[PDB]
Amino acid sequence: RNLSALKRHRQSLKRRLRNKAKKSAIKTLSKKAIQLAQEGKAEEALKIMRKAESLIDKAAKGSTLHKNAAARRKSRLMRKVRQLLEAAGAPLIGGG
Amino acid sequence: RKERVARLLRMHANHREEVEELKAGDLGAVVGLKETITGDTLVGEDAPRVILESIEVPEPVIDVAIEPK
Amino acid sequence: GRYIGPVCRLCRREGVKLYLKGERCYSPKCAMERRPYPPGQHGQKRARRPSDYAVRLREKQKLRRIYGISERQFRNLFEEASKKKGVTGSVFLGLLESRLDNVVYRLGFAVSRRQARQLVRHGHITVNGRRVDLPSYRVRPGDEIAVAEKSRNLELIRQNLEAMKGRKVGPWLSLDVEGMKGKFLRLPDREDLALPVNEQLVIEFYSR
Amino acid sequence: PKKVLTGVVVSDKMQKTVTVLVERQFPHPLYGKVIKRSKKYLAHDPEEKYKLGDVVEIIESRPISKRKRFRVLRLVESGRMDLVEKYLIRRQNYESLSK
Amino acid sequence: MVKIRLARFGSKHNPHYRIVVTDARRKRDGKYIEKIGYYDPRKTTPDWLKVDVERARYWLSVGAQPTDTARRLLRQAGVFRQ
RNA sequence: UUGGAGAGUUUGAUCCUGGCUCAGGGUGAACGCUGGCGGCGUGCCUAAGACAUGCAAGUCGUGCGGGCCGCGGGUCCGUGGUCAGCGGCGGACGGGUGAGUAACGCGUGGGUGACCUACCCGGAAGAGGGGGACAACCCGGGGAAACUCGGGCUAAUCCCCCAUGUGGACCCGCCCCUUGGGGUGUGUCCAAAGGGCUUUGCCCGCUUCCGGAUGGGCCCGCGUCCCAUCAGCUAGUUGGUGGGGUAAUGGCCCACCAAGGCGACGACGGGUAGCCGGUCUGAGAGGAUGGCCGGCCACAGGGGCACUGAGACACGGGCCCCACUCCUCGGGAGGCAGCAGUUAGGAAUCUUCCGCAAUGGGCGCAAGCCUGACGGAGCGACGCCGCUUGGAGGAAGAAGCCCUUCGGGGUGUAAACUCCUGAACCCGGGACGAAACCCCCGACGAGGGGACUGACGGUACCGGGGUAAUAGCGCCGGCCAACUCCGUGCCAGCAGCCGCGGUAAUACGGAGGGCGCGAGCGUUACCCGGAUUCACUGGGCGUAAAGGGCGUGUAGGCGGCCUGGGGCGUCCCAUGUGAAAGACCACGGCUCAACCGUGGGGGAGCGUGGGAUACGCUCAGGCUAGACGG
RNA sequence: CCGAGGGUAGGGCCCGUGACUGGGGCGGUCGUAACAAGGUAGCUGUACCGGAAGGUGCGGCUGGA
Ligand code: SF4
Ligand SMILES: [Mg+2]
Ligand SMILES: [Mg+2]
Ligand SMILES: [Mg+2]
Ligand SMILES: [Mg+2]
Ligand SMILES: [Mg+2]
Ligand SMILES: [Mg+2]
Ligand SMILES: [Mg+2]
Ligand SMILES: [Mg+2]
Ligand SMILES: [Mg+2]
Ligand SMILES: [Mg+2]
Ligand SMILES: [Mg+2]
Ligand SMILES: [Mg+2]
Ligand SMILES: [Mg+2]
Ligand SMILES: [Mg+2]
Ligand SMILES: [Mg+2]
Ligand SMILES: [Mg+2]
Ligand SMILES: [Mg+2]
Ligand SMILES: [Mg+2]
Ligand SMILES: [Mg+2]
Ligand SMILES: [Mg+2]
Ligand SMILES: [Mg+2]
Ligand SMILES: [Mg+2]
Ligand SMILES: [Mg+2]
Ligand SMILES: [Mg+2]
Ligand SMILES: [Mg+2]
Ligand SMILES: [Mg+2]
Ligand SMILES: [Mg+2]
Ligand SMILES: [Mg+2]
Ligand SMILES: [Mg+2]
Ligand SMILES: [Mg+2]
Ligand SMILES: [Mg+2]
Ligand SMILES: [Mg+2]
Ligand SMILES: [Mg+2]
Ligand SMILES: [Mg+2]
Ligand SMILES: [Mg+2]
Ligand SMILES: [Mg+2]
Ligand SMILES: [Mg+2]
Ligand SMILES: [Mg+2]
Ligand SMILES: [Mg+2]
Ligand SMILES: [Mg+2]
Ligand SMILES: [Mg+2]
Ligand SMILES: [Mg+2]
Ligand SMILES: [Mg+2]
Ligand SMILES: [Mg+2]
Ligand SMILES: [Mg+2]
Ligand SMILES: [Mg+2]
Ligand SMILES: [Mg+2]
Ligand SMILES: [Mg+2]
Ligand SMILES: [Mg+2]
Ligand SMILES: [Mg+2]
Ligand SMILES: [Mg+2]
Ligand SMILES: [Mg+2]
Ligand SMILES: [Mg+2]
Ligand SMILES: [Mg+2]
Ligand SMILES: [Mg+2]
Ligand SMILES: [Mg+2]
Ligand SMILES: [Mg+2]
Ligand SMILES: [Mg+2]
Ligand SMILES: [Mg+2]
Ligand SMILES: [Mg+2]
Ligand SMILES: [Mg+2]
Ligand SMILES: [Mg+2]
Ligand SMILES: [Mg+2]
Ligand SMILES: [Mg+2]
Ligand SMILES: [Mg+2]
Ligand SMILES: [Mg+2]
Ligand SMILES: [Mg+2]
Ligand SMILES: [Mg+2]
Ligand SMILES: [Mg+2]
Ligand SMILES: [Mg+2]
Ligand SMILES: [Mg+2]
Ligand SMILES: [Mg+2]
Ligand SMILES: [Mg+2]
Ligand SMILES: [Mg+2]
Ligand SMILES: [Mg+2]
Ligand SMILES: [Mg+2]
Ligand SMILES: [Mg+2]
Ligand SMILES: [Mg+2]
Ligand SMILES: [Mg+2]
Ligand SMILES: [Mg+2]
Ligand SMILES: [Mg+2]
Ligand SMILES: [Mg+2]
Ligand SMILES: [Mg+2]
Ligand SMILES: [Mg+2]
Ligand SMILES: [Mg+2]
Ligand SMILES: [Mg+2]
Ligand SMILES: [Mg+2]
Ligand SMILES: [Mg+2]
Ligand SMILES: [Mg+2]
Ligand SMILES: [Mg+2]
Ligand SMILES: [Mg+2]
Ligand SMILES: [Mg+2]
Ligand SMILES: [Mg+2]
Ligand SMILES: [Mg+2]
Ligand SMILES: [Mg+2]
Ligand SMILES: [Mg+2]
Ligand SMILES: [Mg+2]
Ligand SMILES: [Mg+2]
Ligand SMILES: [Mg+2]
Ligand SMILES: [Mg+2]
Ligand SMILES: [Mg+2]
Ligand SMILES: [Mg+2]
Ligand SMILES: [Mg+2]
Ligand SMILES: [Mg+2]
Incomplete structure (x- = not known):
């Protein structure tokens, strides 16, 4: 029968929603970008990769991703996109 | 035996009223006690350790045996 | 006690x-x-x-x-x-022996340790012009075992101080009489006592 | 320092990993007498170059797997299959300590 | 943040602090980082303060902040004199 | 070289073996009889059973917009109360408990090229532009409450995009360096937020990056209880390749390949237990213990779970299942192992107190607000320490009582009695703990100066006056200090071991006397001691308990004389670590002590470097006295 | 998918309890096995028998003659 505890709880839910929201789009984009590398679609990959790349670090700005996290995400997005394209090359534009 | 007198209550028709004292010639109920039974005198701590007049009368009239099966 | x-x-x-x-x-x-x-x-x-x-x-x-x-x-x-x-x-x-109440007796301020202890417990004694009533005060080399100077005008210190003008406090003690003081100079030797x-x-x- | 230790390879029947048995000696804390005791270390051999008999030094390293926390440092001696028996003949002997 | 404050010792009605450096979120009288000198608020002996001013500077430099009466007995024996 | 005592009881008697028993020290104690003061400690060991009631975490109007109360005057603006709300930081600290846990949990020493750290502090750069959502409040359903719902407007240090890129991040390459450490080049990727006053500038804020500081996470060696009448265990099992996950290594999780991993140096299983600093005992070695205090861990009625966050899988946050309880038909409510308190269990364990004055924590610029942390107070001989119930004189010795050979003996200078002091009480004064935060000069800095504030507390202590003023408990055959008379008559009873009681009991019960302790004395429980009776120090086996019925041999333990290399054990010096409290030596504060403060001395043990080589070890040669052979 | 836990079924260990029964300890009835060559030297492992102690066979021991 008291608090501003519930005020905190109140907040977290608003927060949670946002972390979850950005988090989704990253996965969705990374996966999408990666997907394109398995067919490549060299241009289109990087373009998305770029957008993935960016949405990643962007989320590391707040309480959503740790820096070392976003650092890992990109580190793997990247390796994956380049390596797939190693099967039938043509890297243009740029992200590597 | 010594005994702490925590709270003092008057019992009304509908509610229990707390009261900080209970003067002489009056009745009420004290919360806190632990060893006190009925017909037991009770004195403030630094006072004459008098024992009130007891009471005393009738011896039981009917007798029944009980067997612990 | x-x-x-x-x-x-x-x-x-x-x-x-x-x-x-x-x-x-x-x-x-x-x-x-x-x-x-x-x-x-x-x-x-x-x-x-x-x-x-x-x-x-x-x-x-x-x-x-x-x-x-x-x-x-x-x-x-x-x-x-x-x-x-x-x-x-x-x-x-x-x-x-380094305990107070017995000192007072060694210095004949009082007749017996009993009487001494009373004297000490009563504030009638002071070590170093600080009033001290605890009969277990371990006295250490260098201390001034006064009589309380407001206790001075008192029939019984007198009587006992009076029979103590030139007897000998042992080798470790020094009764400046008249002025009611005295001193604890040495912890005793075994032979001392x-x-x-x-x-x-x-x-x-x-x-x- | 990263603890270095020395011992024999008793199992290489794993894949990029060798079992290194390590003796140590110390005095009995109550009865003085020196006593031997031992411990088998799962040890990282990334280039599979170590084999039965090979007394080696292994070094305290960061975790590689559950229970591999040492990698072999340097081959120190070779072909000590006498120590290898000294440990098989003990193991083997177990089949008659049952009921 | 890391702090300089009075860590009580002594006994009841016998305060006997021990101005000290320790992480803010310790018990008052719990494991400190370094003892940099005592303090006897009652003034029972000639030494009712001896800040190791050599040390007490090193801290203040690297972060350590202090009680509004840690500094009182830190100023009192001048760790602040220009 | 600061340290070491033993007695009783097996016989007719003795010696030996051997068990039992006792004196001692200790306690979170409890019980009996008894009980005056005070100080410091300390006080649910049981049901980690269940809890009534209050309280225990909030703060900021100097991030923002609002609903009501005012106050100077022209339904206005201003400002400060005020209730929320959005928003920040805190709520992960601090407080409680020992249930679980035999574990890298703890201890101790290391590793992290495998890592994170809000605030704090150093240093480098920056703060341009545009946009947008939800509460509040207005509108309207439901409820008996919890209280909720849908629609509509709205601010910001809340929310997003573009630019700026000191710099950071990631892919590839290259230089160094060796586990993912530092540099560099191209591509790509990412920053922000304003408020305030005395307003051409200071104060608090926000952004990215580097370093510091403190705090952590993860990993490794070594130490950590009882049962082998628990002997075999193991499929995420052990290893690998790839990937997910994380701040980060890892079978942490997943798919595939391999067939492994562990065990008599005790795996697996069963029991019991939080560990340590320490505590107690002990000559020591050792045994035993882990309450109070300090450190780590684990837990928040029983489970599971994640969210928010720098940090939690969060004691007084959230979700879900379970048990229980309470409230008056859709549902709701609760979680004292925080402080007090209740109830229950128990041999047993406290006040529903006072104050934020001090110390410390949160928030704020500050004033300040919050703090059952804490500072104190109350109760309890629970423990230890101080203190009182008096001191001097007072008979060849009153009365009563005990004894008696009847003369006497004892209690006993004890009492009475003289006198001296004067616990309690009575009056008068009366604290230290508190000098900072803030205001003033300076420069919001250095130094200076001024002011407010004390729960305990009218307490301690001081000063004056001032009455002879509580004693009890255990024992008195031997161990073991203390002896007589009656009562009793294997009865009543004592009893720790011997044993005592059957008419003359120093052994039962009372008395007088005595011995020992004294606000205590005893008793029961338990730990260590005597126990050299688990023997390392420091024991034994022909007949006392104890040589396997006899071999042969596995592991293991042990191993002749000489020379040499190593230096693993072992010895030595250096160095780091070995927190604080404790213990020890010194001094010092409370009148003393208990209590407490300051300084000193450190050791084992482990890390690191240097050194020695005799003994043991290993390696290398030689020997023939052991051993085998001809 | 995993998942508190609920449920079905079969196992392992522990503890309590149970008509009755087995001996063990503690506080009259039968005989006389042992202790003296104990009146048959004693003891022994085993075996068969016997109200009971025990007796007897076979071997062993002397701690017997
Ligand atoms: S009997 Fe003893 S005490 Fe009494 S006086 Fe003679 S000595 Fe002093
Ligand atoms: Mg999708
Ligand atoms: Mg997060
Ligand atoms: Mg981040
Ligand atoms: Mg006077
Ligand atoms: Mg691996
Ligand atoms: Mg003894
Ligand atoms: Mg006897
Ligand atoms: Mg006999
Ligand atoms: Mg006899
Ligand atoms: Mg004996
Ligand atoms: Mg002694
Ligand atoms: Mg002794
Ligand atoms: Mg009592
Ligand atoms: Mg007090
Ligand atoms: Mg008390
Ligand atoms: Mg408890
Ligand atoms: Mg205990
Ligand atoms: Mg309640
Ligand atoms: Mg508000
Ligand atoms: Mg927080
Ligand atoms: Mg526990
Ligand atoms: Mg176990
Ligand atoms: Mg371990
Ligand atoms: Mg460790
Ligand atoms: Mg935070
Ligand atoms: Mg706007
Ligand atoms: Mg940008
Ligand atoms: Mg698998
Ligand atoms: Mg991997
Ligand atoms: Mg990885
Ligand atoms: Mg696993
Ligand atoms: Mg892997
Ligand atoms: Mg297979
Ligand atoms: Mg082992
Ligand atoms: Mg259990
Ligand atoms: Mg337990
Ligand atoms: Mg001994
Ligand atoms: Mg503790
Ligand atoms: Mg749990
Ligand atoms: Mg729980
Ligand atoms: Mg509970
Ligand atoms: Mg729960
Ligand atoms: Mg919480
Ligand atoms: Mg929770
Ligand atoms: Mg937890
Ligand atoms: Mg609670
Ligand atoms: Mg409570
Ligand atoms: Mg009860
Ligand atoms: Mg209580
Ligand atoms: Mg208390
Ligand atoms: Mg305060
Ligand atoms: Mg404060
Ligand atoms: Mg309060
Ligand atoms: Mg007391
Ligand atoms: Mg006492
Ligand atoms: Mg006479
Ligand atoms: Mg007489
Ligand atoms: Mg007489
Ligand atoms: Mg007298
Ligand atoms: Mg008088
Ligand atoms: Mg004051
Ligand atoms: Mg100025
Ligand atoms: Mg007064
Ligand atoms: Mg006086
Ligand atoms: Mg008298
Ligand atoms: Mg006694
Ligand atoms: Mg005695
Ligand atoms: Mg005697
Ligand atoms: Mg007679
Ligand atoms: Mg009778
Ligand atoms: Mg008796
Ligand atoms: Mg008699
Ligand atoms: Mg007799
Ligand atoms: Mg008697
Ligand atoms: Mg006796
Ligand atoms: Mg014993
Ligand atoms: Mg012993
Ligand atoms: Mg024994
Ligand atoms: Mg021995
Ligand atoms: Mg023996
Ligand atoms: Mg025999
Ligand atoms: Mg033989
Ligand atoms: Mg046999
Ligand atoms: Mg051999
Ligand atoms: Mg040799
Ligand atoms: Mg050997
Ligand atoms: Mg060496
Ligand atoms: Mg220490
Ligand atoms: Mg002193
Ligand atoms: Mg010290
Ligand atoms: Mg040779
Ligand atoms: Mg299941
Ligand atoms: Mg199940
Ligand atoms: Mg269910
Ligand atoms: Mg059964
Ligand atoms: Mg016969
Ligand atoms: Mg015969
Ligand atoms: Mg016969
Ligand atoms: Mg015979
Ligand atoms: Mg026969
Ligand atoms: Mg018959
Ligand atoms: Mg026959
Ligand atoms: Mg025969
Ligand atoms: Mg014979």
């Missing part, structure tokens, strides 16, 4: 005039003179051969009863001794 009861009986059991009564001790009216056997119904009974425990027991109560002190406090002093450097028995008598006490029998007791 202290022993407080019939005190001659102490001496009569112990087979040694302990000079507890002070003023009376030297009188032919002391008890040890008229009957120097043990107190109670069985003294004139031809005494029986004493065990080693007894022998050290009796020896111990002897020392203890002298300084008129609680077996608690006695033992704790004694323990301090053993752990303290060098010769236990000596350092014992030392600390036993004779009491009817085998300093060693007592150590052998607390060894059991």
